[PDB]
Design a protein around this nucleic acid. Structure first.
Ligand SMILES: [Zn+2]
Ligand SMILES: [Zn+2]
Lengths: 96, 81, 129, 87, 125, 100, 216, 24, 208
RNA sequence: GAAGAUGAUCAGAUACCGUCGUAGUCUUAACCAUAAACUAUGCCGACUAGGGAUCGGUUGUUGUUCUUUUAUUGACGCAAUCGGCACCUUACGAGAAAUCAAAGUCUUUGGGUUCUGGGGGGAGUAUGGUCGCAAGGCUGAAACUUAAAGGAAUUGACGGAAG
């Protein structure tokens, strides 16, 4: 019988079972645990300002070979330090 | 066999079926009239008897229970009722 | 164990119809089975059917005429309001011009088309097409 | 199938199996159509005058075609006491 | 080895299916005949074809060969297999004049509307 | 995937079968899985059955046979060519090989 | 100059058989694509996908070209052909031939009222090939072909105007998707509906009434 | 590495962690 | 229905019984049960030759309905039936397929002996499996001489008889030929003795 | 026969192989609660297809052997049947396929019900709890990282595999 209850009075079992099993969905789990609020460097925001600490070149992964030019930024809102890419040919010279 | 008379099975094939697997289940057991050799007194005995039945007149065992049908003792003649 | 004799009856009919047999034996019988079969018989999906009395729940022999595509139960018997019949016919029936959803209403067991004529609704019971 | 004005918009009303009433599809190449001649009282086959049966490929595949012809032919008088309703 | 190939085996048997009446059992006559029947590019292939045609012809005279039909093999065969004995070997005359069917079969005969004399045989094994 | 419907053994309707040791390497192998061969060999090779019969003090003395039942694990048997790798369709054939 | 090699071809070269429904009514096998060309002159094809398949060998890959072609007249007949060849052009040319040989009739029906010509399917149908299952649901007169571009092209060439679609499985396997949809669209003449319950007499096969014209 | 030996390595490493925490 | 002249005559019953037609195989499949009259205590099954006769008349009546006699193909891979089918083709005008049946004769339209029979008649469903299998590809009905162990897949008309008898095969084929000619009018009526003898249609060893 | 000791082999082998060997292997009282604990296939119920074997019970019957000379002896033989452990063929049907009489009766989707999974890793880890004498068991994350990992099958290549 498909392994789930079908009785007309089994709504509690069906409702609880779905509630237990949505925790296997990482999109649902991250939303209720508030992982973006607790763990994300931005704190759930789309953008964040910061202060440039140093300009650093990062080697690309194989099979590519290049120096990806990023910066070390300390976020103003929480003091966390992140690495941010500086796009467009020669835009690292715009960042001090 | 796509077309077949389920309401009127062949009585030959009907008799080979298990007693519960006929259209209407019916026991295959019966009752017998048992004549002991010593005297003549009708004693009704179940065919599948589980008891060592003795006739009233003389205390002689008429049948001994077995796994299935009861086994009538020697000199005892039965007639199905 | 045996929890729904109507599901067993309709499953046996479906298995016999898929194999091209023109008759099927149903055990046990019941009032709901007989009235479900009468609805199927009235619309021509089955032929004459026969009730066998064995001083028990009973048995039925149904004559099939090859017009039956599928008959089935809906477990559980959901409560169906008149406004909910449209949703059930959309999900269960192959088209809007044929097929029937069988309901048990306080006015009796009937197909969804008859239920609309007398403006009654009950619990869903099955389907046939 | 017909429209509101009554014209038969159906192309190809298909055949149905004589044994199981199933529709014989356009590409069911295991399906056959038995044609059995009518015989006059002289014992002669009447030319161009036949008893016709159709069997779906399903019935033939199951091996039930032979028993179905026995039943179908017996109802039409083509056979006597060869097929028995009760088994 | 001296195994002839397919270019000589099939080309030679086409000659038999096409020119059997004009062929013979002599290689020398066949060698000259195949030079006027087929366009053979080389003399060596001509001798090989005629040498295998002669072998097939020599084999047809000893009986029917498999794979070669020359519009006279069966014409001679259609009326060759007409043999039928005067006694039917199935007519009930080899016996005393009645069937030797088993007694169990006689019930089937009795079931049909037949009165056929029988000497029942009961093997019962 | 599953190579054999019998799982390479002969255990159905059973929980556990006590093991046997391979004759060649003494490996514990379940009794149903072991490759078993019953051998009835002459105790004297056919070359020596004549001269030994002449040296016998008994007229018409029958030489006894040597009875033995051999148990092999899968590795013992495959290496000694007691059984061989068969094709996928030929694996299903379980009648004795037609040699005798 | 086409010289038919089958009984059916001879009856079509002569005017004995004039429509494909006589072919379909008796389930006659079609083995010559010239039969379909004569009986369905206005056919449109479409190369739905071209794929390269490789067989590894000792020296290297052996690449061949696989073409998927959908044929139809947009008036109730549709076929599907898949053929592999060394070259794309030969693969497409040969896939068109077997697409013609597979042309089947479909049943158009009405969603709701039967006003006008049939525009949709007469019932829900499903076909399966590999893991792909394609379900076609009759739709009202407004909605076009609600289907993916692969399945939509098959519906248009078959003459269906209004249909809902839903697929499950690896629908990106285009060959399996088209075969499943082709099986589904052909099931319309396999589903018994109450308007087909009436018994029709079994007519004689065209190979019988014209036995001498199909002789040799 | 083999899963059985990877399991054994972690059990020994878990055993070390328990002993180290017991000092405090 | 049918005139009483088509009933099983005592003469034919003598032929059928003398040829051991009624002896069916030890093991009977479920589909051939109606054709069994009784099982002989050794194990052989007795064929209801009354049913055998009626199937022959029905089978011959289907053959007579084919307009072109050449459209009927009679097949036999068994050596015991090769002469029968060859003689059957000569008398009736059918197309005989004796010996090996080339796979693709019905489906491959470029083969040499590519035929399109409207009806295929088979000596044995087991040894002529290829002929029966291909008939299920091009909508060809099949008439088969079936024993009690013969498979019934894709066989429309089964003639219950002994397929493994030297005389049984020839007699059944001879009986079909007589009825096909009787229905066609070649034989003037159902009482005239036929010129052909059942010894013809019997397999002959290379000895003679 | 773990450990350990030893003779060989080896570049090294505290490995395979050889010789000894302690716990252990056995048992009684208690603990432990885990296995590829596998049919990797939950349990209950119904239906859908042919066949021959076999184990237990029952019911009818032999050119059979034997009690004892025969029965009410037993064995065997032939039939039915209920229950099992399985097997063979086919594929109506299912499946990605291998394959499956269930892994079928599932887009024509609903007989009842319990448990479990939601890309690969991190990880059955950390932490808390609880059970245990311990070994450990049960319950059990996250940060972070990653575009595949994986299933079945095909062609080839290779094999200190066979023919
Ligand atoms: Zn008494
Ligand atoms: Zn080993």
């Amino acid at each position: 019988g498909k392994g789930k209850p079908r009785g007309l009075n089994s709504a509690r079992k069906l409702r609880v079972h779905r509630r237990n099993n949505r925790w296997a969905d990482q999109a649902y789990k991250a939303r209720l645990l508030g992982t973006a609020f607790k763990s994300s460097p931005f704190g759930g925001s789309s953008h964040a300002k910061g202060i440039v600490l140093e300009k650093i070149g990062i080697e690309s992964k194989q099979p590519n070979s290049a120096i990806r030019k990023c910066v070390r930024v300390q976020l103003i809102k929480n003091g966390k330090k992140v690495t941010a890419f500086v796009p467009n040919d020669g835009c690292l010279n715009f960042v001090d | 066999v796509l077309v077949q008379d389920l309401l009127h099975p062949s009585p030959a094939t009907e008799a080979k079926q298990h007693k519960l697997k006929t259209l209407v289940q019916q026991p295959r057991s019966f009752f017998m009239d048992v004549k002991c050799q010593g005297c003549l007194n009708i004693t009704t005995v179940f065919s599948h008897a589980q008891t060592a039945v003795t006739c009233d007149s003389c205390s002689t065992v008429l049948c001994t229970p077995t796994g299935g049908k009861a086994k009538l003792t020697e000199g005892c003649s039965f007639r199905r009722k | 164990t045996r929890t729904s004799v109507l599901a067993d009856a309709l499953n046996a009919i479906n298995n016999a119809e898929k194999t091209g047999k023109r008759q099927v034996l149903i055990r046990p019988s019941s009032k709901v089975i007989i009235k479900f079969l009468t609805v199927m018989q009235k619309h021509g999906y089955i032929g004459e059917f026969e009730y066998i009395d064995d001083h028990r729940s009973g048995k039925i022999v149904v004559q099939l005429n090859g017009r039956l595509n599928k008959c089935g139960v809906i477990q559980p018997r959901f409560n169906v309001k008149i406004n909910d019949i449209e949703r059930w016919t959309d999900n269960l029936l192959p088209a809007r011009q044929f097929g029937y959803v069988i309901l048990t209403t306080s006015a009796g067991i009937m197909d969804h088309e008859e239920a609309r004529r007398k403006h009654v609704s009950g619990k869903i019971l099955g389907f046939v097409y | 199938m017909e429209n509101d004005k009554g014209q038969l918009v159906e192309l190809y009303v298909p055949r149905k199996c004589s044994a199981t009433n199933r529709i014989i599809k356009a590409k069911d190449h295991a399906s056959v159509q038995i044609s059995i001649a009518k015989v006059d009282e002289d014992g002669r086959a009447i030319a161009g005058e036949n008893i016709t049966y159709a069997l779906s490929g399903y019935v033939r595949g199951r091996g039930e075609a032979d028993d179905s012809l026995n039943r179908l032919a017996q109802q039409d008088g083509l056979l006597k006491n060869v097929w028995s309703y009760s088994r | 080895g001296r195994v002839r190939t397919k270019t000589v085996k099939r080309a030679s048997k086409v000659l038999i299916e096409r020119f059997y009446p004009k062929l013979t059992l002599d290689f020398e006559t066949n060698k000259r005949l195949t030079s006027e029947i087929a366009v053979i590019q080389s003399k060596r292939l001509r001798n090989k074809i005629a040498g295998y045609t002669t072998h097939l012809m020599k084999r047809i005279q000893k009986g029917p060969v498999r794979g070669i039909s020359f519009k006279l093999q069966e014409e001679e065969r259609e009326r060759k297999d007409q043999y039928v004995p005067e006694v039917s070997a199935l007519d009930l005359s080899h016996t005393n004049g009645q069937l030797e069917i088993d007694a169990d079969t006689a019930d089937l005969v009795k079931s049909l509307g037949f009165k056929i004399p029988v000497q029942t045989v009961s093997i019962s094994a | 995937p599953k190579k054999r419907a019998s799982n390479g053994r002969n255990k159905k309707g059973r929980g556990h079968v006590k093991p046997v040791r391979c004759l060649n390497c003494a490996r514990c192998v379940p009794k149903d899985k072991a490759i078993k061969r019953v051998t009835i060999r002459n105790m004297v090779e056919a070359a020596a059955v004549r001269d030994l019969s002449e040296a016998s003090v008994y007229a018409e003395y029958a030489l006894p046979k040597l009875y033995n039942k051999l148990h092999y694990c899968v590795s013992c048997a495959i290496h000694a060519r007691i059984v061989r790798v068969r094709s996928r369709t030929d694996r299903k054939i379980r009648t004795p090989p037609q040699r005798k | 100059g086409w010289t038919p090699v089958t009984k059916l071809g001879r009856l079509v070269k002569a005017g004995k058989i004039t429509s494909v429904e006589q072919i379909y009514l008796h389930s006659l096998p079609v083995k010559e694509y010239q039969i379909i060309d004569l009986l369905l002159p206005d056919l449109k094809d479409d190369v739905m996908k071209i794929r390269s398949v490789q067989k590894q060998t000792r020296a290297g890959q052996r690449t061949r070209m696989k073409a998927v072609v959908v044929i139809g007249d947009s008036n109730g007949h549709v076929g599907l052909g898949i053929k592999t060849a060394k070259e794309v052009a030969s693969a497409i040319k040969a896939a068109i031939v077997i697409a013609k040989l597979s042309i089947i009739p479909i049943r158009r029906g009405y969603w709701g009222s039967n006003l006008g010509q049939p525009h949709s399917l007469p019932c829900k149908v499903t076909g399966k090939c590999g893991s792909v299952a394609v379900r076609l649901i009759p739709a009202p007169r407004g909605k076009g072909i609600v289907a993916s571009p692969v399945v939509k092209r098959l519906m248009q060439l078959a003459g269906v105007e209004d249909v809902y679609t839903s697929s499950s499985g690896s629908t990106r396997t285009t060959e399996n998707t088209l075969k499943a949809a082709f099986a589904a669209i052909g099931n319309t003449y396999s589903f018994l509906t109450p308007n087909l319950w009436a018994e029709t007499p079994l007519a004689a096969s065209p190979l019988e009434v014209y036995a001498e014209e199909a002789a040799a | 590495m083999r899963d059985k030996w990877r399991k054994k390595r972690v059990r020994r490493l878990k055993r070390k962690r328990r002993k180290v925490r017991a000092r405090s | 229905s049918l005139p009483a002249s088509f009933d099983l005559t005592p003469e034919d019953a003598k032929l059928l019984l003398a040829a051991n037609v009624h002896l069916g195989a030890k093991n009977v499949q479920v589909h051939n049960k109606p054709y069994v009259y009784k099982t002989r205590p050794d194990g052989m099954n007795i064929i209801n030759i009354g049913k055998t006769w009626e199937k022959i008349v029905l089978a011959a009546r289907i053959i007579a309905a084919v307009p072109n006699a050449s459209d009927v193909a009679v097949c036999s891979s068994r050596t015991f039936g090769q002469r029968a089918v060859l003689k059957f083709a000569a008398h009736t005008g059918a197309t005989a397929i004796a010996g090996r049946f080339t796979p693709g004769n019905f489906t491959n339209y470029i083969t040499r002996s590519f035929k399109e029979p409207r009806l295929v008649v088979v000596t044995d469903p087991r040894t002529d499996a290829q002929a029966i299998k291909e008939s299920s590809y091009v909508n060809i009905p099949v008439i088969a001489l079936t024993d009690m162990d013969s498979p019934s897949e894709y066989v429309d008309v089964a003639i219950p008889c002994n397929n493994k008898g030297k005389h049984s095969i020839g007699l059944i084929w001879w009986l079909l030929a007589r009825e096909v000619l009787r229905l066609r009018g070649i034989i003037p009526d159902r009482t005239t003795e036929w010129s052909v003898m059942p010894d013809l249609y019997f397999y002959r060893d290379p000895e003679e």
